[PDB]
Scaffold this active site. Sequence first.
Site, PDB file in Angstrom:
ATOM      1  N   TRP B 127       0.806  -1.215   0.000  1.00 38.71           N
ATOM      2  CA  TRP B 127       0.000   0.000   0.000  1.00 38.71           C
ATOM      3  C   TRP B 127       0.828   1.248   0.000  1.00 38.71           C
ATOM      4  O   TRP B 127       0.432   2.265  -0.607  1.00 38.71           O
ATOM      5  CB  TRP B 127      -0.978   0.007   1.188  1.00 38.71           C
ATOM      6  CG  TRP B 127      -0.408   0.263   2.540  1.00 38.71           C
ATOM      7  CD1 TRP B 127      -0.140  -0.668   3.495  1.00 38.71           C
ATOM      8  CD2 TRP B 127      -0.136   1.535   3.132  1.00 38.71           C
ATOM      9  NE1 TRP B 127       0.335  -0.064   4.630  1.00 38.71           N
ATOM     10  CE2 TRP B 127       0.331   1.293   4.445  1.00 38.71           C
ATOM     11  CE3 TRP B 127      -0.241   2.857   2.693  1.00 38.71           C
ATOM     12  CZ2 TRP B 127       0.701   2.315   5.305  1.00 38.71           C
ATOM     13  CZ3 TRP B 127       0.141   3.889   3.573  1.00 38.71           C
ATOM     14  CH2 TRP B 127       0.591   3.603   4.859  1.00 38.71           C
ATOM     15  N   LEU B 222       8.009   2.247  18.236  1.00 33.33           N
ATOM     16  CA  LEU B 222       8.174   1.576  16.945  1.00 33.33           C
ATOM     17  C   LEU B 222       7.115   2.012  15.936  1.00 33.33           C
ATOM     18  O   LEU B 222       5.987   2.311  16.320  1.00 33.33           O
ATOM     19  CB  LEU B 222       8.045   0.044  17.112  1.00 33.33           C
ATOM     20  CG  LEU B 222       9.098  -0.720  17.912  1.00 33.33           C
ATOM     21  CD1 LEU B 222       8.707  -2.192  17.893  1.00 33.33           C
ATOM     22  CD2 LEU B 222      10.506  -0.502  17.353  1.00 33.33           C
ATOM     23  N   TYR B 225       4.537   0.410  10.433  1.00 30.62           N
ATOM     24  CA  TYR B 225       5.079  -0.102   9.176  1.00 30.62           C
ATOM     25  C   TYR B 225       6.457   0.492   8.966  1.00 30.62           C
ATOM     26  O   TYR B 225       6.688   1.651   9.303  1.00 30.62           O
ATOM     27  CB  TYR B 225       4.148   0.170   7.992  1.00 30.62           C
ATOM     28  CG  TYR B 225       3.568   1.577   7.921  1.00 30.62           C
ATOM     29  CD1 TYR B 225       4.090   2.533   7.055  1.00 30.62           C
ATOM     30  CD2 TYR B 225       2.483   1.932   8.681  1.00 30.62           C
ATOM     31  CE1 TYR B 225       3.539   3.826   6.975  1.00 30.62           C
ATOM     32  CE2 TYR B 225       1.943   3.229   8.615  1.00 30.62           C
ATOM     33  CZ  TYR B 225       2.476   4.149   7.767  1.00 30.62           C
ATOM     34  OH  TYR B 225       1.900   5.407   7.718  1.00 30.62           O
ATOM     35  N   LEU B 228       9.883   4.871   6.474  1.00 26.67           N
ATOM     36  CA  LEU B 228       9.836   6.168   7.147  1.00 26.67           C
ATOM     37  C   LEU B 228       8.634   7.011   6.729  1.00 26.67           C
ATOM     38  O   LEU B 228       8.388   7.231   5.560  1.00 26.67           O
ATOM     39  CB  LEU B 228      11.104   6.960   6.874  1.00 26.67           C
ATOM     40  CG  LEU B 228      11.371   8.195   7.727  1.00 26.67           C
ATOM     41  CD1 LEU B 228      11.816   7.817   9.113  1.00 26.67           C
ATOM     42  CD2 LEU B 228      12.426   9.092   7.026  1.00 26.67           C
ATOM     43  N   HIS B 229       7.894   7.487   7.722  1.00 29.05           N
ATOM     44  CA  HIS B 229       6.735   8.334   7.495  1.00 29.05           C
ATOM     45  C   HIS B 229       6.591   9.263   8.684  1.00 29.05           C
ATOM     46  O   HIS B 229       7.044   8.952   9.790  1.00 29.05           O
ATOM     47  CB  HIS B 229       5.456   7.493   7.322  1.00 29.05           C
ATOM     48  CG  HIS B 229       5.256   6.470   8.400  1.00 29.05           C
ATOM     49  ND1 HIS B 229       4.346   6.625   9.430  1.00 29.05           N
ATOM     50  CD2 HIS B 229       5.855   5.274   8.612  1.00 29.05           C
ATOM     51  CE1 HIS B 229       4.402   5.571  10.223  1.00 29.05           C
ATOM     52  NE2 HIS B 229       5.305   4.737   9.753  1.00 29.05           N
TER      53      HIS B 229
HETATM   54  N1  LIG Z   1      -3.557   7.222   2.856  1.00 31.20           N
HETATM   55  C1  LIG Z   1      -3.414   6.034   3.461  1.00 31.20           C
HETATM   56  N2  LIG Z   1      -3.002   6.028   4.767  1.00 31.20           N
HETATM   57  C2  LIG Z   1      -2.798   4.880   5.425  1.00 31.20           C
HETATM   58  N3  LIG Z   1      -2.407   4.909   6.719  1.00 31.20           N
HETATM   59  C3  LIG Z   1      -3.078   3.622   4.700  1.00 31.20           C
HETATM   60  C4  LIG Z   1      -2.958   2.284   5.290  1.00 31.20           C
HETATM   61  O1  LIG Z   1      -2.545   2.170   6.599  1.00 31.20           O
HETATM   62  C5  LIG Z   1      -2.590   0.884   7.205  1.00 31.20           C
HETATM   63  C6  LIG Z   1      -2.216   0.976   8.676  1.00 31.20           C
HETATM   64  C7  LIG Z   1      -2.301  -0.409   9.308  1.00 31.20           C
HETATM   65  C8  LIG Z   1      -2.097  -0.453  10.833  1.00 31.20           C
HETATM   66  N4  LIG Z   1      -2.468   0.805  11.481  1.00 31.20           N
HETATM   67  C9  LIG Z   1      -2.177   0.974  12.890  1.00 31.20           C
HETATM   68  C10 LIG Z   1      -2.487  -0.205  13.789  1.00 31.20           C
HETATM   69  C11 LIG Z   1      -1.595  -1.247  13.996  1.00 31.20           C
HETATM   70  C12 LIG Z   1      -1.897  -2.300  14.855  1.00 31.20           C
HETATM   71  C13 LIG Z   1      -3.095  -2.360  15.557  1.00 31.20           C
HETATM   72  C14 LIG Z   1      -4.015  -1.345  15.412  1.00 31.20           C
HETATM   73 CL1  LIG Z   1      -5.556  -1.342  16.281  1.00 31.20          CL
HETATM   74  C15 LIG Z   1      -3.749  -0.215  14.526  1.00 31.20           C
HETATM   75 CL2  LIG Z   1      -4.979   1.068  14.304  1.00 31.20          CL
HETATM   76  C16 LIG Z   1      -2.986   2.015  10.834  1.00 31.20           C
HETATM   77  C17 LIG Z   1      -3.256   1.857   9.339  1.00 31.20           C
HETATM   78  C18 LIG Z   1      -3.238   1.173   4.499  1.00 31.20           C
HETATM   79  C19 LIG Z   1      -3.619   1.331   3.153  1.00 31.20           C
HETATM   80  C20 LIG Z   1      -3.755   2.571   2.575  1.00 31.20           C
HETATM   81  C21 LIG Z   1      -3.507   3.718   3.284  1.00 31.20           C
HETATM   82  N5  LIG Z   1      -3.635   4.926   2.724  1.00 31.20           N
END
Ligand SMILES: Nc1nc(N)c2c(OCC3CCN(Cc4cccc(Cl)c4Cl)CC3)cccc2n1
Lengths: 289, 286
Positions: B127, B222, B225, B228-229
């Site tokens: 993604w 940590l 993902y 870096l963001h």
């Molecule tokens: N624009 C935009 N932004 C993003 N962040 C995207 C995206 O982000 C996946 C992560 C996946 C994991 N966690 C945080 C998280 C980790 C573990 C447990 C919980 Cl309970 C949570 Cl909440 C936020 C989201 C995926 C696809 C497209 C995206 N597109």
Amino acid sequence: VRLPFSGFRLQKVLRESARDKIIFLHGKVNEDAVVILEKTPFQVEQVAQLLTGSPELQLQFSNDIYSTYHLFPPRQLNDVKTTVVYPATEKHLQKYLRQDLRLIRETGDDYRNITLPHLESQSLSIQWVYNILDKKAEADRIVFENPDPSDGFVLIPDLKWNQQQLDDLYLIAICHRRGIRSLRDLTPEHLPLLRNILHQGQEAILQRYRMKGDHLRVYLHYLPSYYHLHVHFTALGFEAPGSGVERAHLLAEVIENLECDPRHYQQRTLTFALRADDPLLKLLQEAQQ
Amino acid sequence: LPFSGFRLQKVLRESARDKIIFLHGKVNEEDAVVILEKTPFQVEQVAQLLTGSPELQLQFSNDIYSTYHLFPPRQLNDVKTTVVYPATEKHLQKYLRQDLRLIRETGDDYRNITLPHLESQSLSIQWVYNILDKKAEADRIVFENPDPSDGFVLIPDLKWNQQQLDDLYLIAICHRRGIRSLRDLTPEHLPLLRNILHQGQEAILQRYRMKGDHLRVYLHYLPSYYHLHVHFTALGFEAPGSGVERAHLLAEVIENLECDPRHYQQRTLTFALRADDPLLKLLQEA
Ligand SMILES: Nc1nc(N)c2c(OCC3CCN(Cc4cccc(Cl)c4Cl)CC3)cccc2n1
């Protein structure tokens, strides 16, 4: 059927939290009313049945295995808990109001030249602090004490923690030594004290409440709420107000900063938030333009 | 939905404070996770409703205090719904409620314990690459510096429905590949970090009219993902991982690197791990 008044005209959002899905509104009526609206938790059966039965879903976007939607549920999921205070007194309006905050980055020199003089321009009493340290008040609430007048401290539960569960555990260490106003005063001279607070404080909590150190967030505020060094000990699960990165500084990192960079807290730029109506904010802003 | 016939397997996690629920269901009978979150209030529209004929039921009353059930019109009832499909076992465990513990990772702990443990895993960030390569969400990009080395894409985060500024939340994703976290940052990355901070904030000022002193701009450690963001959040929003035990302000990351080039390789970092995370055991042991 109807609200206990007529003609709601919004004066001010007293407080809002997008995290907690809650808003506190001050409205003029006719007189003052506070209306507090809070979204409700989901009931599992209601969601499970919705997801198998023609839900009104609309895409915000997708990407790989992820997709996000707007869902407009049937009435049973849409309850909003609505609390009305009417008439609201100035005390109500004050108890709910929180000022919007603005971030400032304060250099070592900004502190010396602007902030410190501004603090010295005020007369703020901490006699309540001294009364605790001297055992004149709240001696029955102290959980732990290192009585040393230079490196010692007392550990006392936060007043708002009913001690009825560990989920919201919150104690404060207050040092015996006088005149350490904040982070900005800390030097390697204070390492023994700071180590005592961290190690002895965590040990006292392990003994008294059976909570291990790796379950504790231990930190200082900058700016602090009063200008006598004190350290917060909260349950890690308790995301207490003031544990945000814009205010909180981990005691363990304060110690390690002093150990490798003795003048860190006099030289480095610190970041904090001020209420938008705080005169210090204007002074720092004017000095930084 | 991207599938048919959601059969509940498990409530993975729920919060009454956050008004959110995470469900594991069976579909196309495949695993899916469905996340439902109540949305923030629309203030002016709520005030409009209150001065009209809102649908109310009185729950209780005592002099100046009364409590009601309010059933708003359809347009105010939006529930933010996120679907993960197909969901792997990693997804199912990730969203499961779990107790967190703090750990203090020294520079040597990272090199000898954490990094080998990371390097041993096979994690998808497809993604992320889809955003950078314009294969997904290209239309949603708010700002881009396309320099392959010091450039980035600024885009609203999945968390934010974009319907109000109170929870404003964008991420800057760098174009440069293989920067996994804080631990990989050196002075080499200072131009990139500066670009993210200044161009990112200027973009938000121009688009949203939100000044930099209304923003909390930070990285996670940590990270969720390992590319870096940087999180750009409204200061008023109690934003994800904005607590001192996870968040590192971008301005301070920059200044730390300027003061000490090896800061993020040498210094001990403090963060929370889930009790069921094998990294927690590995670090405690060492
Ligand atoms: N624009 C935009 N932004 C993003 N962040 C995207 C995206 O982000 C996946 C992560 C996946 C994991 N966690 C945080 C998280 C980790 C573990 C447990 C919980 Cl309970 C949570 Cl909440 C936020 C989201 C995926 C696809 C497209 C995206 N597109």
